[PDB]
């Protein structure tokens, strides 16, 4: 049983560390359009202009 | 009677020597066993990796 414990245990320690570079990833992705959106904004003032 | 005696317990003396290197033996594979486990907790966190 415990081997089964720590085979889940440790698999989901790794699984947790890969979800939290994909939390970085996102993150970074986010940062992105953030400022495609302050250009967007910009391109409407522009538009507007 | 005695001889047949004599007969049991010496050569249940050997045969109590030939299980006890058969213990030894069945624990080095225990052993062995053993990584071969800790092997397989890696393969488990390198396939999540």
Redesign the interface.
Same mark, same amino acid.
């Given at each position: 049983i415990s *081997?089964r414990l720590?085979?889940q245990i440790?698999?989901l320690n790794?699984?947790t560390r *890969?979800a939290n570079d994909g939390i970085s990833l996102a993150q970074t992705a986010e940062g992105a359009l953030q400022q495609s959106t302050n250009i967007l904004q910009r391109i409407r003032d522009l538009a507007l202009q």
């Open positions: *081997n720590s085979n440790s698999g790794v699984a *890969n």
